[PDB]
Amino acid sequence: RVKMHVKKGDTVLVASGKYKGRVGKVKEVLPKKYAVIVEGVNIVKKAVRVSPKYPQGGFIEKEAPLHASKVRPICPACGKPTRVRKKFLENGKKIRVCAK
Amino acid sequence: MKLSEVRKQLEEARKLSPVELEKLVREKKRELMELRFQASIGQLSQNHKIRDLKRQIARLLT
Amino acid sequence: SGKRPIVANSIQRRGKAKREGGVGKKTTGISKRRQYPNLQKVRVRVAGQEITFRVAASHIPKVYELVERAKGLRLEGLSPKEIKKELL
Amino acid sequence: TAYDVILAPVLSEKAYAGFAEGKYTFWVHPKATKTEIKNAVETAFKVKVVKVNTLHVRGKKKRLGRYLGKRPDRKKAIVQVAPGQKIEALEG
RNA sequence: UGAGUAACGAUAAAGAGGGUGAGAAUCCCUCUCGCCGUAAGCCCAAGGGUUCCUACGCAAUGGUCGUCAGCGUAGGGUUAGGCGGGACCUAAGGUGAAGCCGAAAGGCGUAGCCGAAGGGCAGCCGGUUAAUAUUCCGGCCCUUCCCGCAGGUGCGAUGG
RNA sequence: GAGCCGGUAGCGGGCGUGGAUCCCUGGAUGUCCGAAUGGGGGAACCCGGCCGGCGGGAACGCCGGUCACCGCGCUUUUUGCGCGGGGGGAACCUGGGGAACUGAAACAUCUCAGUACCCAGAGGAGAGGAAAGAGAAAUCGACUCCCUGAGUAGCGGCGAGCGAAAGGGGACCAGCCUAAACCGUCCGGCUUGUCCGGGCGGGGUCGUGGGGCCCUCGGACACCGAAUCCCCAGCCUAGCCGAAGCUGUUGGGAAGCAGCGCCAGAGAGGGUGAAAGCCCCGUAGGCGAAAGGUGGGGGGAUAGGUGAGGGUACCCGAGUACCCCGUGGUUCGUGGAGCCAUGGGGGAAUCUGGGCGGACCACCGCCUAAGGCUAAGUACUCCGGGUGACCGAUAGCGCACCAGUACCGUGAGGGAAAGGUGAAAAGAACCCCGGGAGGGGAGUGAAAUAGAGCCUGAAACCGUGGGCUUACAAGCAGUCAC
Ligand SMILES: [Mg+2]
Ligand SMILES: [Mg+2]
Ligand SMILES: [Mg+2]
Ligand SMILES: [Mg+2]
Ligand SMILES: [Mg+2]
Ligand SMILES: [Mg+2]
Ligand SMILES: [Mg+2]
Ligand SMILES: [Mg+2]
Ligand SMILES: [Mg+2]
Ligand SMILES: [Mg+2]
Ligand SMILES: [Mg+2]
Ligand SMILES: [Mg+2]
Ligand SMILES: [Mg+2]
Ligand SMILES: [Mg+2]
Ligand SMILES: [Mg+2]
Ligand SMILES: [Mg+2]
Ligand SMILES: [Mg+2]
Ligand SMILES: [Mg+2]
Ligand SMILES: [Mg+2]
Ligand SMILES: [Mg+2]
Ligand SMILES: [Mg+2]
Ligand SMILES: [Mg+2]
Ligand SMILES: [Mg+2]
Ligand SMILES: [Mg+2]
Ligand SMILES: [Mg+2]
Ligand SMILES: [Mg+2]
Ligand SMILES: [Mg+2]
Ligand SMILES: [Mg+2]
Ligand SMILES: [Mg+2]
Ligand SMILES: [Mg+2]
Ligand SMILES: [Mg+2]
Ligand SMILES: [Mg+2]
Ligand SMILES: [Mg+2]
Ligand SMILES: [Mg+2]
Ligand SMILES: [Mg+2]
Ligand SMILES: [Mg+2]
Ligand SMILES: [Mg+2]
Ligand SMILES: [Mg+2]
Ligand SMILES: [Mg+2]
Ligand SMILES: [Mg+2]
Ligand SMILES: [Mg+2]
Ligand SMILES: [Mg+2]
Ligand SMILES: [Mg+2]
Ligand SMILES: [Mg+2]
Ligand SMILES: [Mg+2]
Ligand SMILES: [Mg+2]
Ligand SMILES: [Mg+2]
Ligand SMILES: [Mg+2]
Ligand SMILES: [Mg+2]
Ligand SMILES: [Mg+2]
Ligand SMILES: [Mg+2]
Ligand SMILES: [Mg+2]
Ligand SMILES: [Mg+2]
Ligand SMILES: [Mg+2]
Ligand SMILES: [Mg+2]
Ligand SMILES: [Mg+2]
Ligand SMILES: [Mg+2]
Ligand SMILES: [Mg+2]
Ligand SMILES: [Mg+2]
Ligand SMILES: [Mg+2]
Ligand SMILES: [Mg+2]
Ligand SMILES: [Mg+2]
Ligand SMILES: [Mg+2]
Ligand SMILES: [Mg+2]
Ligand SMILES: [Mg+2]
Ligand SMILES: [Mg+2]
Ligand SMILES: [Mg+2]
Ligand SMILES: [Mg+2]
Ligand SMILES: [Mg+2]
Ligand SMILES: [Mg+2]
Ligand SMILES: [Mg+2]
Ligand SMILES: [Mg+2]
Ligand SMILES: [Mg+2]
Ligand SMILES: [Mg+2]
Ligand SMILES: [Mg+2]
Ligand SMILES: [Mg+2]
Ligand SMILES: [Mg+2]
Ligand SMILES: [Mg+2]
Ligand SMILES: [Mg+2]
Ligand SMILES: [Mg+2]
Ligand SMILES: [Mg+2]
Ligand SMILES: [Mg+2]
Ligand SMILES: [Mg+2]
Ligand SMILES: [Mg+2]
Ligand SMILES: [Mg+2]
Ligand SMILES: [Mg+2]
Ligand SMILES: [Mg+2]
Ligand SMILES: [Mg+2]
Ligand SMILES: [Mg+2]
Ligand SMILES: [Mg+2]
Ligand SMILES: [Mg+2]
Ligand SMILES: [Mg+2]
Ligand SMILES: [Mg+2]
Ligand SMILES: [Mg+2]
Ligand SMILES: [Mg+2]
Ligand SMILES: [Mg+2]
Ligand SMILES: [Mg+2]
Ligand SMILES: [Mg+2]
Ligand SMILES: [Mg+2]
Ligand SMILES: [Mg+2]
Ligand SMILES: [Mg+2]
Ligand SMILES: [Mg+2]
Ligand SMILES: [Mg+2]
Ligand SMILES: [Mg+2]
Ligand SMILES: [Mg+2]
Ligand SMILES: [Mg+2]
Ligand SMILES: [Mg+2]
Ligand SMILES: [Mg+2]
Ligand SMILES: [Mg+2]
Ligand SMILES: [Mg+2]
Ligand SMILES: [Mg+2]
Ligand SMILES: [Mg+2]
Ligand SMILES: [Mg+2]
Ligand SMILES: [Mg+2]
Ligand SMILES: [Mg+2]
Ligand SMILES: [Mg+2]
Ligand SMILES: [Mg+2]
Ligand SMILES: [Mg+2]
Ligand SMILES: [Mg+2]
Ligand SMILES: [Mg+2]
Ligand SMILES: [Mg+2]
Ligand SMILES: [Mg+2]
Ligand SMILES: [Mg+2]
Ligand SMILES: [Mg+2]
Ligand SMILES: [Mg+2]
Ligand SMILES: [Mg+2]
Ligand SMILES: [Mg+2]
Ligand SMILES: [Mg+2]
Ligand SMILES: [Mg+2]
Ligand SMILES: [Mg+2]
Ligand SMILES: [Mg+2]
Ligand SMILES: [Mg+2]
Ligand SMILES: [Mg+2]
Ligand SMILES: [Mg+2]
Ligand SMILES: [Mg+2]
Ligand SMILES: [Mg+2]
Ligand SMILES: [Mg+2]
Ligand SMILES: [Mg+2]
Ligand SMILES: [Mg+2]
Ligand SMILES: [Mg+2]
Ligand SMILES: [Mg+2]
Ligand SMILES: [Mg+2]
Ligand SMILES: [Mg+2]
Ligand SMILES: [Mg+2]
Ligand SMILES: [Mg+2]
Ligand SMILES: [Mg+2]
Ligand SMILES: [Mg+2]
Ligand SMILES: [Mg+2]
Ligand SMILES: [Mg+2]
Ligand SMILES: [Mg+2]
Ligand SMILES: [Mg+2]
Ligand SMILES: [Mg+2]
Ligand SMILES: [Mg+2]
Ligand SMILES: [Mg+2]
Ligand SMILES: [Mg+2]
Ligand SMILES: [Mg+2]
Ligand SMILES: [Mg+2]
Ligand SMILES: [Mg+2]
Ligand SMILES: [Mg+2]
Ligand SMILES: [Mg+2]
Ligand SMILES: [Mg+2]
Ligand SMILES: [Mg+2]
Ligand SMILES: [Mg+2]
Ligand SMILES: [Mg+2]
Ligand SMILES: [Mg+2]
Ligand SMILES: [Mg+2]
Ligand SMILES: [Mg+2]
Ligand SMILES: [Mg+2]
Ligand SMILES: [Mg+2]
Ligand SMILES: [Mg+2]
Ligand SMILES: [Mg+2]
Ligand SMILES: [Mg+2]
Ligand SMILES: [Mg+2]
Ligand SMILES: [Mg+2]
Ligand SMILES: [Mg+2]
Ligand SMILES: [Mg+2]
Ligand SMILES: [Mg+2]
Ligand SMILES: [Mg+2]
Ligand SMILES: [Mg+2]
Ligand SMILES: [Mg+2]
Ligand SMILES: [Mg+2]
Ligand SMILES: [Mg+2]
Ligand SMILES: [Mg+2]
Ligand SMILES: [Mg+2]
Ligand SMILES: [Mg+2]
Ligand SMILES: [Mg+2]
Ligand SMILES: [Mg+2]
Ligand SMILES: [Mg+2]
Ligand SMILES: [Mg+2]
Ligand SMILES: [Mg+2]
Ligand SMILES: [Mg+2]
Ligand SMILES: [Mg+2]
Ligand SMILES: [Mg+2]
Ligand SMILES: [Mg+2]
Ligand SMILES: [Mg+2]
Ligand SMILES: [Mg+2]
Ligand SMILES: [Mg+2]
Ligand SMILES: [Mg+2]
Ligand SMILES: [Mg+2]
Ligand SMILES: [Mg+2]
Ligand SMILES: [Mg+2]
Ligand SMILES: [Mg+2]
Ligand SMILES: [Mg+2]
Ligand SMILES: [Mg+2]
Ligand SMILES: [Mg+2]
Ligand SMILES: [Mg+2]
Ligand SMILES: [Mg+2]
Ligand SMILES: [Mg+2]
Ligand SMILES: [Mg+2]
Ligand SMILES: [Mg+2]
Ligand SMILES: [Mg+2]
Ligand SMILES: [Mg+2]
Ligand SMILES: [Mg+2]
Ligand SMILES: [Mg+2]
Ligand SMILES: [Mg+2]
Ligand SMILES: [Mg+2]
Ligand SMILES: [Mg+2]
Ligand SMILES: [Mg+2]
Ligand SMILES: [Mg+2]
Ligand SMILES: [Mg+2]
Ligand SMILES: [Mg+2]
Ligand SMILES: [Mg+2]
Ligand SMILES: [Mg+2]
Ligand SMILES: [Mg+2]
Secondary structure (H helix, E strand, O other): OOOOOOOOOOEEEEOOOOOOOOEEEOOEEEHHHOEEEOOOOEOOOOOOOOOOOOOOOOOOOOEOOEEHHHEEEOOOOOOOOOOOEOOOOOOEOOOOOOOO | OHHHHHHHHHHOOOOOHHHHHHHHHHHHHHHHHHHHHHHHOOOOOOOOHHHHHHHHHHHHHO | OOOOOOOOOOEEOOEEOOEEOOOOOEEOOEEOOEEOOOEEEEEOOOOOOOOEEEEEOOOHHHHHHHHHHHHOOOOOOOOHHHHHHHOO | OOOOOEEEEOOOHHHHHOOOOOEEEEEEOOOOOHHHHHHHHHHHHOOOEEEEEEEEEOOOOOEEOOEEOOOOOEEEEEEEEOOOOOOHHHHO
């Protein structure tokens, strides 16, 4: 429980290190590790292939899990902290001034 | 989701229920005996089926 | 043991031997020792059947007093031990 | 609780070789009786069973890395089907 | 440090050719030689618990070496109405209704119950697997139990 | 309220806003062993009765149900049926038993100590508890716990040692039910009775003595009130809301430095590539339960309870009080030895009774024994939470780690060692020597003497290279001079 955090799968700004200011959508979020993948961090896995099945398996540069505290959600501006206003039924996150 | 549907059909299996469910499990335990055999020979099974079934049997048992 | 209407165990209380005057002094030697309750069997009738009581010598009478109260009592039923019991 | 006696067919050269005769053989519940084996294999493949042999298989004790362990025991059983008939299911 | 020292675990003993292999005194085969043979051979009981068999493999285990292995990984392997034990009996002992004893815990104890390498009980010869076999198969042979029949008789028990 | 199919990646294959995983509550299912409970037994196995079912099913097997012993009560003995016991729990508690070392500078009384330990039992506590009290005040007023009283009064081979109570200050606060006289009724017995007894109901509970019965008061609606009962508040077992920053600059990476600015009932603390009130998780303040648990705190009801006078002497806990013998408790070791308790012997009384105020006696006081129950204040920490001039892997629990393990012991029982790459796995493709291991290059990284039991990486110890020195020398290995 409570492992949950900032945004889910959507647009986000990177206030990290080697990718500060960068922007992208989050294509995965690993709560078990409190990190998310965007489109930013990319390292070279010279590795032949991960699992013995399939001959070729790639030098893939794929995106490295980014620590969830180095990414802020964003909407009609520069990404604000998340408030939560409950509607007349449910509840959804209003940014520092707008919806969604 | 699967639950929802399957479960209703069981107090629905109340037309001869107690008897019917019994009959039902019997076939269900068998459908799964088929699987455990097919999985045993290996190339002829794709997992989940077996657990989804095991679990069905159970709730159904109720 | 103690058992019956008696109600008396066996107390372990020491016996200390001494050498003395009382008009000059009095000195010692001391050891634990167990005092037993003088204890006898009591046989009695009570309707059919006999019935014994492993009682202390003190309350031997209490037992007869009990058979007297038993006359006012409704008993039988092949109750050898059972009488004693239902015999309060 | 009847398809629960027979667990799985045992796959071995030795087990296949038994197919020649009416001798089919498979893993069964460890607490299973030759008699309850019969009435089960019978009503699960519709065939008269004439004879049942059973035996336990002490599970081999393996170990992965520093962690030492044990595989589970099983009771293997070999059914003899009435002259003629056969279990197509095993015949693969 | 002693120190490349003592030791490498029975003085039954070795040699060679061929093969394998990255590597061979040390693994495989062959020939020669030697040792045991009331055993150093075979079979069963206890104990031991996969060490059995096969494939792959040598870092460590092996007092050297190691391609080998009782070692690592993996797969296979133990079939019974008659063999052994149990659904039979009782021994010493144990336990223990009844009964007795004991400050508590407990101690004793008839019947009974438990307790065997003793009593009782139906399988022999041969084949087959890498690996089981009075267990699978072949031949020949037998026991108990239930049902029915036919024949026979007072049948009937933890009691005598 | 977005992910999910534990630690645990991979092969393979699935699930989720038709609201999954996950968390809280309740229910279901729950193999065999264990109090172990049909019987057996070398726990985790073996064998069986009765009833119903499953298969061709009578032989066989399986499934569902059921069958231990013991106490108490209905059961007329009967055989039944019904409620209860059994076993476990770290410490704490009470009761039955109960040491020695050691101290006394030996040792026996004495001490250690009614401790250690064994046993039974109690339970969230346990024990104790409404005066046959204390003790000198013509005073106090259940019990328990703390302070004090006091190292006093005492006890003591007057050695070593041991060591009270009343009184005062606090915590807490609460009182009750029976036995008996007498009355009614059910049953038994027998020397039928105006009875004996057993059970059940009324009645009654005290020390200004109370109660019973009789007569007078009027005998009353009222008055008090639970420690039992009901509901509610509250609380616990999941959660939720929550203020305020952005730019530049050094850097592998800013949370640093600089610029300007913002919240604060919040500048506790943790994290994010380094040093952050304003990025994340929080914190202040506040919000929350369908279900289980708890719950006089508040509220309500029932049980229960409450008066005066006069007369009669019925009753007022028995092998008991009481004295004696043997002991234990107390500060009290036989001491002038009382008090409380009690193994043996003798053995009363019912208020004109009986106990006590340290032998005894008198006087004067206090108190009502031989039936029972009772909350809180107290003790403990298995468990959850909070906090530290507590530890930081030879410390801290034996265990930070897959430890009561590995290993040792027949067994009781003994009992270890072992934590750290990196911000990230980016964990080193591919080539090169090699059978492999392991190297060299390539590549990732801020860093690879961070390269995988990998942070730092000390000392002993082993080694290559370099400088100076040594084969006519006499030695605590240094020291002084050249
Ligand atoms: Mg989104
Ligand atoms: Mg490639
Ligand atoms: Mg923008
Ligand atoms: Mg139907
Ligand atoms: Mg159908
Ligand atoms: Mg059901
Ligand atoms: Mg006796
Ligand atoms: Mg006595
Ligand atoms: Mg006793
Ligand atoms: Mg004496
Ligand atoms: Mg004298
Ligand atoms: Mg003396
Ligand atoms: Mg002594
Ligand atoms: Mg002594
Ligand atoms: Mg006599
Ligand atoms: Mg008797
Ligand atoms: Mg007497
Ligand atoms: Mg009487
Ligand atoms: Mg009787
Ligand atoms: Mg009788
Ligand atoms: Mg009795
Ligand atoms: Mg009765
Ligand atoms: Mg094969
Ligand atoms: Mg075969
Ligand atoms: Mg046939
Ligand atoms: Mg047969
Ligand atoms: Mg067998
Ligand atoms: Mg093995
Ligand atoms: Mg050396
Ligand atoms: Mg040499
Ligand atoms: Mg040499
Ligand atoms: Mg030498
Ligand atoms: Mg020499
Ligand atoms: Mg030598
Ligand atoms: Mg030697
Ligand atoms: Mg030698
Ligand atoms: Mg050669
Ligand atoms: Mg080779
Ligand atoms: Mg070669
Ligand atoms: Mg050669
Ligand atoms: Mg040779
Ligand atoms: Mg070889
Ligand atoms: Mg010879
Ligand atoms: Mg000879
Ligand atoms: Mg034998
Ligand atoms: Mg092995
Ligand atoms: Mg082969
Ligand atoms: Mg093969
Ligand atoms: Mg080989
Ligand atoms: Mg090797
Ligand atoms: Mg070697
Ligand atoms: Mg070879
Ligand atoms: Mg092997
Ligand atoms: Mg024979
Ligand atoms: Mg047999
Ligand atoms: Mg037997
Ligand atoms: Mg036997
Ligand atoms: Mg016998
Ligand atoms: Mg005997
Ligand atoms: Mg006993
Ligand atoms: Mg007893
Ligand atoms: Mg005995
Ligand atoms: Mg035995
Ligand atoms: Mg026997
Ligand atoms: Mg025998
Ligand atoms: Mg024999
Ligand atoms: Mg024969
Ligand atoms: Mg034969
Ligand atoms: Mg013969
Ligand atoms: Mg063999
Ligand atoms: Mg045969
Ligand atoms: Mg006859
Ligand atoms: Mg006759
Ligand atoms: Mg006869
Ligand atoms: Mg999740
Ligand atoms: Mg997963
Ligand atoms: Mg897993
Ligand atoms: Mg997985
Ligand atoms: Mg995975
Ligand atoms: Mg996977
Ligand atoms: Mg996959
Ligand atoms: Mg989750
Ligand atoms: Mg999860
Ligand atoms: Mg639950
Ligand atoms: Mg079930
Ligand atoms: Mg059992
Ligand atoms: Mg039972
Ligand atoms: Mg038993
Ligand atoms: Mg039946
Ligand atoms: Mg049947
Ligand atoms: Mg059951
Ligand atoms: Mg049964
Ligand atoms: Mg008995
Ligand atoms: Mg009983
Ligand atoms: Mg009752
Ligand atoms: Mg009864
Ligand atoms: Mg009744
Ligand atoms: Mg009655
Ligand atoms: Mg009865
Ligand atoms: Mg009747
Ligand atoms: Mg009866
Ligand atoms: Mg019964
Ligand atoms: Mg009975
Ligand atoms: Mg009842
Ligand atoms: Mg209890
Ligand atoms: Mg208990
Ligand atoms: Mg005591
Ligand atoms: Mg005691
Ligand atoms: Mg001594
Ligand atoms: Mg001495
Ligand atoms: Mg003492
Ligand atoms: Mg004690
Ligand atoms: Mg007892
Ligand atoms: Mg207990
Ligand atoms: Mg209490
Ligand atoms: Mg009490
Ligand atoms: Mg009183
Ligand atoms: Mg003392
Ligand atoms: Mg002291
Ligand atoms: Mg005091
Ligand atoms: Mg006081
Ligand atoms: Mg006070
Ligand atoms: Mg306080
Ligand atoms: Mg008071
Ligand atoms: Mg009466
Ligand atoms: Mg009575
Ligand atoms: Mg009465
Ligand atoms: Mg009454
Ligand atoms: Mg009353
Ligand atoms: Mg009154
Ligand atoms: Mg009173
Ligand atoms: Mg009066
Ligand atoms: Mg009246
Ligand atoms: Mg009137
Ligand atoms: Mg009145
Ligand atoms: Mg009350
Ligand atoms: Mg809360
Ligand atoms: Mg909760
Ligand atoms: Mg919300
Ligand atoms: Mg915030
Ligand atoms: Mg700032
Ligand atoms: Mg610039
Ligand atoms: Mg600058
Ligand atoms: Mg830069
Ligand atoms: Mg910045
Ligand atoms: Mg600075
Ligand atoms: Mg503002
Ligand atoms: Mg904290
Ligand atoms: Mg700072
Ligand atoms: Mg900070
Ligand atoms: Mg709050
Ligand atoms: Mg509420
Ligand atoms: Mg509600
Ligand atoms: Mg309260
Ligand atoms: Mg009333
Ligand atoms: Mg009144
Ligand atoms: Mg009067
Ligand atoms: Mg009188
Ligand atoms: Mg009495
Ligand atoms: Mg008397
Ligand atoms: Mg009297
Ligand atoms: Mg008398
Ligand atoms: Mg006396
Ligand atoms: Mg008196
Ligand atoms: Mg006196
Ligand atoms: Mg005497
Ligand atoms: Mg004397
Ligand atoms: Mg005395
Ligand atoms: Mg004592
Ligand atoms: Mg004394
Ligand atoms: Mg003292
Ligand atoms: Mg004393
Ligand atoms: Mg005294
Ligand atoms: Mg006295
Ligand atoms: Mg006495
Ligand atoms: Mg007295
Ligand atoms: Mg006094
Ligand atoms: Mg005086
Ligand atoms: Mg007094
Ligand atoms: Mg009193
Ligand atoms: Mg009295
Ligand atoms: Mg009283
Ligand atoms: Mg009292
Ligand atoms: Mg009392
Ligand atoms: Mg109490
Ligand atoms: Mg406290
Ligand atoms: Mg704690
Ligand atoms: Mg804490
Ligand atoms: Mg703290
Ligand atoms: Mg600290
Ligand atoms: Mg360490
Ligand atoms: Mg440690
Ligand atoms: Mg360290
Ligand atoms: Mg260490
Ligand atoms: Mg601990
Ligand atoms: Mg622990
Ligand atoms: Mg482990
Ligand atoms: Mg552990
Ligand atoms: Mg551990
Ligand atoms: Mg370990
Ligand atoms: Mg271990
Ligand atoms: Mg050993
Ligand atoms: Mg051992
Ligand atoms: Mg060590
Ligand atoms: Mg470790
Ligand atoms: Mg990876
Ligand atoms: Mg390399
Ligand atoms: Mg190449
Ligand atoms: Mg090569
Ligand atoms: Mg190569
Ligand atoms: Mg390497
Ligand atoms: Mg390499
Ligand atoms: Mg390189
Ligand atoms: Mg680089
Ligand atoms: Mg730098
Ligand atoms: Mg470094
Ligand atoms: Mg290493
Ligand atoms: Mg570090
Ligand atoms: Mg050198
Ligand atoms: Mg040199
Ligand atoms: Mg130099
Ligand atoms: Mg030089
Ligand atoms: Mg010299
Ligand atoms: Mg010199």
